[PDB]
């Protein structure tokens, strides 16, 4: 989905569902062409980052079933933020060389799960992507046997 | 020192990043150098 | 903390509620049942309406409150605008139509769909441009709603 | 499907099927060498050096099960910086004791006289770490820096 | 009192970190291969003509701060110890100064490179972060027009200088597929069949999950790049009708090029655009904001201004120091009478 | 008779609801019930009272 | 709360169209603002009467 779509179908539905949160100064938004949106509720310096965590999530829980079924399965999450990394843990290959597709999958399906759940981690950004069953259709071969992606 | 702790918000407690321990040094000093020293100055010397 | 516990057991009874009530609200908040301020907004010139003022006051002001300083829940005296479609049973009978055909025709034509992009994400080496595709957009006005093909 | 003929249409016949990444947007290189990284973003509040003290430990216990050539590097780490903002403080602290030790030996002279004011100095500083917990105050670094401003 | 006015402010010393990072931004609708060409030019620099300084480079394509995209790239630069780079020319200060100059010297695109602010963010020292809001509910085009008017007519204030630039921006040409709803229903194809065909074959569809070596993983269907690089590849896609035969896209779809934003910001539930600027080589913050407030107040109706991150809120040295030294004076005078008494001694020290 | 929440639409850069209910004219009386028609499988209208 | 609820309302008044005016049919603010002015006046009198 495009930037204009994700703003109207996701961003606006969540923003309009942000009323009665104990403390807060402002909220920001992004809604990108990539089909990704981030809404950051910034609180007063001293507020409980654990209680400010869950209030916002509960009003997202009221806007949750108004979001399309495609975006519901695809993520949705609330966490504490810093926008500054402590550690970047590079994992390279120097033998039977794998790939950007291969290392990024392994590092996520062996390591990433153990982190993020560990010591006070906000959110780990994995540099790559874990494996998925990628099915690459051919429109001419679909036409040849009277088939649609459906 | 301590009335620096009527600081701001996003300059967090950066002015409260002391006052407290410069006091927790000076008040500790005017407590250690109060009980001790006088005692240590009486033991050693001349 | 008494706020969020109750919400989490509502979260276990959430998918047992009909799909009609799920989209229509559901919320948990702190209460007092006694107002601090009633902010009357009247017109004294090019006079609007109960339908007109109540919409504006909600689509310009209400959103800024409720999210502000320690507000439990704002009760807006009126209602914000909706695309009101007033069916005629005789005119429905005249063209062999049921409210079902009306509803089905709406979400089929008044919809925000998401298509991919040119130059995708796993591209062909030598791709010069990368631009998003826009298909169906969400309808804006009363005239556009008057042109849904049944 | 199985069209009127007895033939069979398979997903391999209609589509290229491969085991690849779920998205192809971001790719990384370590000195131009293809590599994936574990970029860790901090939580609000939390505990910085206490976090990195166990983030290595979580990473440490999976290293043995690694296949051929899978090696861990550190392109970006804030740990050695904080580990230095104390080594550059204690060294200044120790010097501030010896530089006092000499000034005492200059104006009033004798070890039997320089000892007294130099025994009184670590105790005030030590007991300050203690009173950092106290009631409802701190316990941090840069607080171990205004420490030298108080030294 | 003169030496305490000529001296500038500053928030916290911009210290060397041992690690700094660079950023890359490309024009409207650039590709991953195009970004890689620039990233390969950036990664080359550190490894080639700056060996005895740089430890390692973690170059990442696609990742950009402010927002990801097939347009942005960043690289994490590690540095070799502290003692191994002795000179003032050997530590970040001049390395960034060199890199900034070297990347900006000759480039078809745009690359910066900068230092870590030694904290999280909020407020550099004198610079600013403005925000312009759609108040009356105007169009996005009308918001961009008022945002343009602000940037352009604030740029004609280099006397009492500022340095103002927006964030993201772009607003790239997009391809809109216009489905003829009545032609489709006339020939016998479902709208649900078309929108899925356009969605799954061009964007990719999450079908379900599967088990890969004892782990739950996703299943995606997208189609080869081969058949989605061109606008002509749209008509190559076929959807069957009720009578059970294939129908191409161009037979029911209109193809048009159109402008559109790839990044739409919103502030407090209302559409908005972020403006990022500077104070001045002479003026600082106070006047820099005040100028920006009525440079925005002289814009069209329903354009209302607001301030965000650097906009404090209520902090700094100003509005902090006059209440800092105030009660650092009411008590300094006071307990200077404990075992001291008269109005004499609290001048025998106070001054 | 009750009104149906179909979906959402954009009104001047704001997400708003879409409701279909029918004019009051045809829902003030119990006799207005039989005035409503539903088509069958053979594709022709059938009243409520039937 | 009411010290900032007016403030949130204050910044949207300029963008109002023709005849859109704010009135106060019900407010508890002036009451609490008086439950101090009727205390300080009693306080001050209690000093002078002493």
* CB-nearest partner of F6 from C80, C88, C107: C107
Nearest CA in chain D to A107: D36
Looking at the structure, tell me whether residues E288 and E163 fall in a common domain. yes
E68: CATH: 3.30.70.1430
Nearest to E220 by CA among A35, G20, A135: A135
Contact E115, E20 (CB under 8 A): yes
Q: Terminal CA-to-CA distance of chain C, rounded, Å?
A: 51
How far off is chain C from G46, nearest CA to CA, in Å?
32
Q: Does E82 touch chain A (CB under 8 A)?
A: no
Looking at the structure, tell me whether residues E42 and E94 fall in a common domain. yes
Q: Cis link prior to E313 (omega < 30° from 0)? A: yes
Looking at the structure, tell me whether residues E140 and E248 fall in a common domain. no
Nearest to A83 by CA among E116, D91, F20, E282: E116
Query: Is A44 in contact with B9 (Cβ distance < 8 A)?
Result: yes
Write down the CATH number for the domain with range A1-81: 3.30.70.1430
Encode E184-194: b = buried (16+ Cβ within 10 Å), e = exposed.
bbeeebbbebb
Looking at the structure, tell me whether residues E179 and E243 fall in a common domain. yes
Query: Is A33 in contact with E237 (Cβ distance < 8 A)?
Result: no
Contact C83, C146 (CB under 8 A): no
CB-CB neighbors (< 8 A) of B26 in chain D:
150
Q: Decide: helix, strand or coil at residue D17.
A: strand
What the block records as the tokens of E157 is 């204030």
Q: Given in angstroms, what resolution was this structure solved at? A: 3.4
* CB-nearest partner of A91 from D35, D44, D46: D35
> What distance in Å separates the CA atoms of residue E339 and residue E335, rounded to the nearest whole number?
9
What the block records as the tokens of A131 is 């494996």
CB-CB neighbors (< 8 A) of B41 in chain D:
116
Strand order in the sheet with E205-211: D15-21, A131-137, E216-221, E205-211
Looking at the structure, tell me whether residues E71 and E180 fall in a common domain. no
Window 249-278 of E, Cβ < 8 Å to C: 258, 260, 262, 268-270
Looking at the structure, tell me whether residues E70 and E97 fall in a common domain. yes
Q: Decide: helix, strand or coil at residue E4.
A: coil
Nearest to B36 by CA among E316, D118, D8: D118
Q: Which domain holds residue E23?
A: 17-121
Contacting residues for C12 by C-beta, under 8 A, at least 6 apart: none
How far off is chain E from G21, nearest CA to CA, in Å?
16
Looking at the structure, tell me whether residues E182 and E236 fall in a common domain. yes
> What distance in Å separates the CA atoms of residue E322 and residue E330, rounded to the nearest whole number?
12
* CB-nearest partner of A35 from C30, C67, C114: C114
CB-CB neighbors (< 8 A) of B10 in chain A:
45
> What distance in Å separates the CA atoms of residue E265 and residue E259, rounded to the nearest whole number?
17
What the block records as the tokens of D140 is 């941090």
* CB-nearest partner of B8 from E12, E315, E328: E315
- Strand pairing class (D15-21; A131-137): antiparallel
* DSSP secondary structure string for all residues of D18-35: EEEES--S-EEEETTEEE
Say if G and A touch: at least 3 Cβ pairs within 8 Å: no
For A149, counting Cβ atoms within 10 Å of its Cβ (0-12 exposed, 13-18 middle, 19+ buried), the class is buried
* CB-nearest partner of E197 from A16, A83, A148: A148
CB-CB neighbors (< 8 A) of C121 in chain D:
23-25
Distance of CA A11 to the CA centre of its chain: 14
How far off is chain G from E139, nearest CA to CA, in Å?
15
Among A6, A7, A12, A31, the strongest candidate for a mutation testing the F interface, having the largest count of F CBs within 10 A, is A12
> What distance in Å separates the CA atoms of residue E221 and residue D15, rounded to the nearest whole number?
9
**CA distance to A28, D101, D145, E270, per residue, from E133 (Å):** 12, 64, 43, 7
Q: Decide: helix, strand or coil at residue A63.
A: helix
Contact E274, E131 (CB under 8 A): yes
Nearest CA in chain A to B12: A45
* DSSP secondary structure string for all residues of chain F: ---EEEEEEESSSSEEEEEE---GGGTSSGGGSTT-EEE-TTS-EEES--
* CB-nearest partner of D123 from B21, B32, B41: B32
Q: Does A12 touch chain D (CB under 8 A)?
A: no
Q: Which chains touch D (3 or more CB pairs under 8 A)?
A: A, B, C, E
Query: What is the total residue count of chain G?
Result: 50
Query: Is C120 in contact with E174 (Cβ distance < 8 A)?
Result: no
How far off is chain E from B40, nearest CA to CA, in Å?
26
Window 39-68 of C, Cβ < 8 Å to E: 59-60, 63-64, 67
> What distance in Å separates the CA atoms of residue D74 and residue C20, rounded to the nearest whole number?
53
Nearest to A69 by CA among D21, C108, C134, E208: E208
- Strand pairing class (E266-267; E270-277): antiparallel
Window 2-41 of B, Cβ < 8 Å to D: 17-18, 20-22, 24-26, 28-29, 32-33, 36-37, 40-41
Count of other CB atoms within 10 angstroms of residue E27? 12
CB-CB neighbors (< 8 A) of A109 in chain E:
212-213, 215, 217
Nearest 5°: CA angle at E12, between E8 and E18? 130
* DSSP secondary structure string for all residues of C80-138: ---EEE---HHHHHHTT--HHHHHHHHHHHS------EET-SS--TT----EEEE----
β-partners of residue E38 are: none
Contact A89, D38 (CB under 8 A): yes
What the block records as the tokens of D89 is 């403080």
Q: Does A44 touch chain B (CB under 8 A)?
A: yes
Contact A115, D58 (CB under 8 A): yes
Q: Does A67 touch chain F (CB under 8 A)?
A: no
CB-CB neighbors (< 8 A) of D46 in chain E:
none
E302: CATH: 3.30.70.1440
> What distance in Å separates the CA atoms of residue A11 and residue A4, rounded to the nearest whole number?
10
> What distance in Å separates the CA atoms of residue E239 and residue E193, rounded to the nearest whole number?
7
Contact G16, C48 (CB under 8 A): no
Q: Which chains touch E (3 or more CB pairs under 8 A)?
A: A, B, C, D, F, G
Contact E264, E274 (CB under 8 A): no
**CA distance to B15, E14, E126, per residue, from E321 (Å):** 10, 22, 17
Say if G and F touch: at least 3 Cβ pairs within 8 Å: no
Contact D77, A88 (CB under 8 A): yes
> What distance in Å separates the CA atoms of residue A145 and residue A140, rounded to the nearest whole number?
9
Element (H, E) at E134: none
Residues in chain C whose Cβ is within 8 Å of chain D: 120-122
**In A33-134, where does DSSP find H-type helix?**
51-63, 69-73, 100-107
Contacting residues for B39 by C-beta, under 8 A, at least 6 apart: none
Looking at the structure, tell me whether residues E232 and E309 fall in a common domain. no
Contact C39, G22 (CB under 8 A): yes
């Amino acid at each position: 989905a495009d930037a204009k779509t994700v703003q109207d179908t996701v961003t606006q539905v969540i923003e309009q569902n942000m009323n009665g949160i104990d403390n807060l100064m402002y909220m920001s938004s992004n809604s990108d062409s990539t089909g990704t949106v981030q809404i950051t509720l910034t609180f007063e310096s001293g507020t409980d980052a654990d209680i400010a965590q869950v209030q916002v999530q509960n009003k997202l829980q009221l806007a949750m079933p108004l979001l399309p079924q495609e975006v519901q399965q695809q993520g949705v999450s609330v966490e504490k933020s810093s926008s500054s990394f402590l550690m970047v843990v590079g994992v390279i290959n120097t033998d039977g060389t794998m790939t950007q597709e291969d290392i990024s999958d392994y590092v996520a399906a062996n390591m990433k799960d153990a982190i993020s759940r560990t010591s006070g981690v906000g959110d780990v950004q994995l540099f790559g992507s874990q494996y998925a069953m990628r099915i690459w259709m051919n429109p001419n071969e679909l036409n040849k046997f009277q088939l649609t992606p459906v | 020192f301590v009335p620096m702790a009527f600081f701001g918000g996003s300059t967090g407690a950066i002015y409260r990043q002391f006052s407290i321990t410069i006091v927790s040094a000076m008040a500790l000093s005017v407590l250690v150098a109060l009980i001790l020293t006088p005692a240590l100055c009486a033991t050693m010397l001349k | 903390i008494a706020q969020v516990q109750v919400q989490n057991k509502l979260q276990l009874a959430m998918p047992l509620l009909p799909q009609e009530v799920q989209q229509q609200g559901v919320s948990v908040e702190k209460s007092s049942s006694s107002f601090l301020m009633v902010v009357g907004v009247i017109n004294t010139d090019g006079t609007m309406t109960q339908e007109d003022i109540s919409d504006y006051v909600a689509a310009n002001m209400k959103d800024a409150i409720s999210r502000t300083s320690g507000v439990g829940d704002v009760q807006l005296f009126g209602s914000q605008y909706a695309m009101r479609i007033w069916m005629n049973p005789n005119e429905l009978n005249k063209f062999q139509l049921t409210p079902v055909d009306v509803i089905t025709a709406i979400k089929a034509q008044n919809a925000q769909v998401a298509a991919g992009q040119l130059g995708g994400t796993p591209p062909v080496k030598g791709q010069q441009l990368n631009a998003s595709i826009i298909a169906q957009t969400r309808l804006t006005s009363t005239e556009e709603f008057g042109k849904i093909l049944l | 499907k199985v069209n009127q003929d007895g033939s069979r249409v398979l997903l391999r016949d209609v589509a290229k099927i491969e085991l690849g990444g779920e998205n192809y947007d971001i790719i990384a290189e370590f000195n131009g060498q293809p590599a994936s990284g574990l970029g860790i973003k901090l939580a609000t509040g939390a505990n910085a050096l206490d976090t990195a003290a166990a983030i290595r430990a979580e990473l440490a216990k999976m290293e043995p099960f690694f296949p051929s050539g899978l090696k861990i590097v550190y392109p970006y780490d804030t740990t050695p910086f904080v580990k230095i903002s104390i080594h550059e403080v204690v060294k200044t602290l120790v010097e501030a004791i010896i530089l006092v030790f000499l000034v005492m030996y200059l104006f009033l002279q004798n070890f039997r006289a320089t000892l007294i004011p130099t025994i009184a100095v670590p105790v005030v500083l030590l007991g300050t770490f203690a009173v950092l917990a106290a009631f409802g105050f701190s316990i941090n670094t840069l607080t171990m820096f205004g420490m030298v401003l108080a030294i | 009192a003169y030496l305490f006015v000529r001296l500038p402010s500053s928030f916290l010393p911009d210290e060397d970190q041992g690690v700094f990072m660079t950023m890359v931004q490309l024009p409207a609708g650039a590709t991953q291969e195009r970004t890689q060409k620039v990233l390969n030019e950036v990664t080359h620099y550190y490894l080639t003509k700056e060996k005895n300084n740089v430890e390692s480079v973690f170059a990442v394509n696609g990742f950009g701060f402010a927002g990801r995209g097939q347009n942005t790239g960043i690289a994490f630069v590690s540095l070799k110890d502290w003692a191994d780079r002795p000179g003032e020319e050997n530590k970040v200060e001049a390395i960034t100064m060199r890199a900034t100059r070297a990347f900006s010297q000759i480039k078809d695109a745009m690359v910066f490179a900068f230092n870590l602010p030694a904290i999280v963010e909020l407020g550099t020292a004198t610079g600013f972060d403005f925000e312009l809001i759609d108040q009356a509910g105007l169009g996005h085009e009308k918001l961009t027009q008022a945002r343009n008017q602000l940037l352009a007519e604030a740029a004609k204030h280099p006397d009492m200088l500022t340095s103002v630039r927006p964030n993201g921006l772009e607003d790239t040409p997009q391809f809109k597929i216009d489905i003829d709803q009545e032609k489709a229903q006339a020939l016998g194809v479902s709208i649900n069949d078309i929108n899925t065909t356009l969605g799954a074959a061009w964007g990719g569809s999450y079908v379900n999950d599967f088990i890969d070596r004892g782990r739950v993983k996703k299943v995606y269907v997208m189609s080869e790049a081969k058949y989605r690089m061109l606008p002509d590849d749209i008509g190559d896609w076929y959807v069957r009708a009720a009578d059970g035969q294939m129908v191409p896209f161009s037979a029911f779809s209109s193809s048009r090029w159109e402008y559109g934003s790839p990044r739409l910001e919103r502030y407090n539930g209302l559409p908005s655009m972020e403006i990022l600027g500077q104070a001045a080589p002479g003026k600082s913050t106070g006047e820099a904001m005040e100028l920006m407030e009525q440079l925005a107040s002289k814009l069209p109706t329903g354009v209302g201004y607001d301030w965000t991150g650097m906009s404090y809120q209520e902090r700094l040295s100003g509005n902090q120091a006059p209440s800092l030294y105030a009660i650092s004076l009411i008590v300094v005078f006071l307990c200077l009478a404990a075992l001291y008494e008269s109005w004499s001694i609290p001048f025998s020290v106070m001054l």
